[PDB]
């Protein structure tokens, strides 16, 4: 039947990618000088969480950040004075992700419950209240990011993604091309395309307005846990449980560089790029985080000091500091 | 010195910290458990009989109180068959109450495999598991009927004897007791294959209508509490 057609199409795609492959990223970029040893110091230490922190997100002002822990509380941290700005109590304690609006007026959250809760931080009474509840998914929400003050994309464990309108509250665009549970997604700088990785050992690119899959990169051998976009909007790095990070390019449609080590046999939990994209940070299950060279594939630095599994990483817009959240209910700012 | 805005921010942070401590008091006073089991395991019966909202809800919570101690049991709702990802969220739970049908000889072995996924998990390796062998009356009726033979599914049952520490209930057939203890030992071998002291199993026989099970769970949790207080103080 058509299974042979799918097989021959995949073979043709693989042959085309092999023909378009001239040289690896490590061979062409071998003439440059390495960065060297990166030694980042802890500037601020955030304490106060109860359960294990699962995700965080930085703001556009590079001052305030949002932290989400499984105790049922969203905490707004000040990166400068370490002061708590807002404490939003959640109806469901088993949350897994959080999102900060670009304007700083709304904050989204979700988790095992198939409901994305958006809270308004600019209420006329100075407090925070439930502003919107988006329901309709049939799986746990893994990650969500804001595109504007009226629309938001969400990835759920039902192998589908949905673009919700804050004003209306219904699914405007649905993506069902994935096979496994979508674990994370990253938005492009122009908010036109976004890559999302699922538990099917493959990631897919989707359009916000077109609502169709553009390209698919398998690359890995296990479930992809996190994914982050390159600052230029043309590449993206993915981390999986096989202890190997892989950089793919949307324009090249092939794998660029693989970051791995022999002594590393632990999966990747979160990845993020700096402002320039030269350094790639990745949290591992070995209670430590590693910053590799995106152009040389060498271990540039180790941000050790966490007493539990590293859960989330976050780089500011200006790349002046990096927040690391682990299951020890503490956030650490490194610079 | 700090400005007025800085003082206001410090006061707000202090109020938020006080609220967080007030919430942490209740969070520490309340215990959390994770209920797991197959479709025919009878989880709906255990969720009910609690003597103390959307259609696509993926998590259900049942709050009850035993001996002035609050327990919140969480059950998986509208979720797919893949569980290797979201179950990692339950790494900090007090106990996992896993239900197993005692009469369903077909899926029993399958349940055993599932039990392995709960025991040999790299994230659930330090979490206690309370085994509920549900539907004991159905098992007794099926054993008294004699239509189905356990040897057709488990041949080692033909070479199994009653343990010495067995406690037969007053008014129970010997074959039912033999099958019950055989299933118990089959679960205990899989549990102790990788226990190594860091975690233990809590076997409990559950019938159709039992109101004391929760209380038993309480005792179990109590034991867990001790097993979490002796390793910190340095005595176990």
């Amino acid at each position, epitope marked *: 039947q058509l299974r042979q057609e799918a097989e021959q199409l995949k073979n043709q795609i693989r042959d085309a990618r092999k023909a378009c492959a001239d040289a690896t990223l490590s061979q062409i970029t071998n003439n440059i000088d390495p960065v060297g040893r990166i030694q980042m110091r802890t500037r601020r230490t955030l304490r106060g969480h109860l359960a294990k922190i699962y995700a965080m997100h930085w703001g556009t002002d590079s001052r305030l950040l949002v932290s989400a822990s499984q105790d049922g509380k969203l905490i707004i941290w000040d990166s400068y004075t370490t002061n708590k700005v807002h404490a939003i109590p959640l109806r469901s304690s088993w949350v897994m992700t959080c999102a900060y609006a670009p304007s700083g007026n709304y904050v989204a959250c979700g988790g095992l419950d198939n409901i994305c809760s958006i809270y308004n931080l600019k209420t006329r009474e100075g407090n925070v209240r439930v502003s919107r509840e988006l329901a309709g998914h049939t799986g746990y929400l893994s990650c969500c990011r804001f595109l504007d003050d009226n629309q938001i994309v969400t990835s759920s464990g039902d192998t589908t993604c949905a673009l919700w309108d804050i004003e209306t509250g219904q699914q405007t665009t649905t993506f069902t091309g994935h096979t496994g549970d979508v674990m994370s997604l990253s938005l492009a700088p122009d908010t036109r395309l976004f890559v999302s990785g699922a538990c099917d050992a493959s990631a897919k690119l989707w359009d916000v307005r077109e609502g169709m899959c553009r390209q698919t990169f398998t690359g890995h051998e296990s479930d992809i846990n996190a994914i982050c976009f390159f600052p230029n909007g043309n590449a993206f790095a993915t981390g999986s449980d096989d202890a190997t990070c892989r950089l793919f390019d949307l324009r090249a449609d092939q794998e660029l560089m693989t970051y791995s080590h022999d002594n590393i046999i632990c999966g990747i939990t979160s990845v993020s790029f700096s402002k320039s994209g030269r350094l790639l940070l990745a949290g591992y299950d070995d209670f430590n985080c590693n910053v590799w060279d995106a152009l040389k594939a060498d271990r540039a630095g180790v941000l050790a000091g966490h007493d539990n599994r590293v859960s989330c990483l976050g780089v500011t817009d200006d790349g002046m500091a990096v927040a690391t959240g682990s299951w020890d209910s503490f956030l650490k700012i490194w610079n | 010195t700090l400005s007025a805005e800085d003082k206001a921010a410090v006061e707000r942070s202090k109020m938020i910290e006080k609220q967080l401590q007030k919430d942490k008091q209740v969070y520490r006073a309340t215990h959390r458990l994770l209920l797991l089991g197959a479709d025919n395991s009878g989880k709906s019966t255990i969720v009910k009989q609690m003597r103390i909202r959307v259609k696509t809800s993926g998590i259900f919570e049942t709050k009850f109180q035993v001996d002035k101690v609050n327990f919140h049991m969480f059950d998986v709702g509208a979720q797919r068959d893949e569980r290797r990802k979201w179950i990692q969220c339950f790494n900090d739970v007090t106990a996992i109450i896993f239900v197993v049908d005692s009469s369903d000889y077909n899926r029993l072995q399958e349940a055993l495999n599932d039990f*392995k996924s709960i025991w040999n998990n790299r994230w659930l390796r330090t979490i206690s598991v309370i085994l509920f062998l549900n539907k004991q009356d159905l098992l007794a009726e099926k054993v008294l009927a004699g239509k189905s033979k356990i040897e057709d599914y488990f041949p080692e049952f033909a070479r199994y004897t009653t343990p010495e520490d067995a406690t037969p209930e007053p008014g129970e057939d010997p074959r039912v007791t033999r099958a019950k203890y055989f299933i118990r030992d089959e679960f205990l071998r899989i549990s102790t294959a990788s226990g190594d002291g860091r975690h233990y199993c809590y076997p409990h026989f559950t019938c159709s209508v039992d109101t004391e099970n929760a209380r038993r769970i309480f005792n179990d949790v109590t034991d867990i509490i001790i097993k979490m207080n002796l390793r910190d103080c340095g005595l176990f």
Partner: nanobody
Amino acid sequence: QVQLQESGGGLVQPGGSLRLSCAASGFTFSNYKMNWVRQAPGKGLEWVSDISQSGASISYTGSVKGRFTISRDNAKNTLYLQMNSLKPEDTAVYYCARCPAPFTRDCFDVTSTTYAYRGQGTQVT
């Protein structure tokens, strides 16, 4: 891309013998735990056997314990399963599952209906 190709199934009279072979591609065969499961017509997915990376830990289900034997070939990266003394109730489609996380021993989601790291299966009668 992860790919599992199973072969060796066919029409066999009750009491014969078979040698199923599963070839893996797209990942390291020696660094993952393998499992063989079966699906009967009208019934759900049933686990049959499992073998670890180094082949030291091998386990079988109570239904086929003593009759089937599973083995690995890291040089050829092939999973072999010799089935002897076939029974009429053993007629089922056999599938090969691979553990999602490397260097682990928990076989999670190996019996799920939708699993990416599992081949299309072969007909065995």
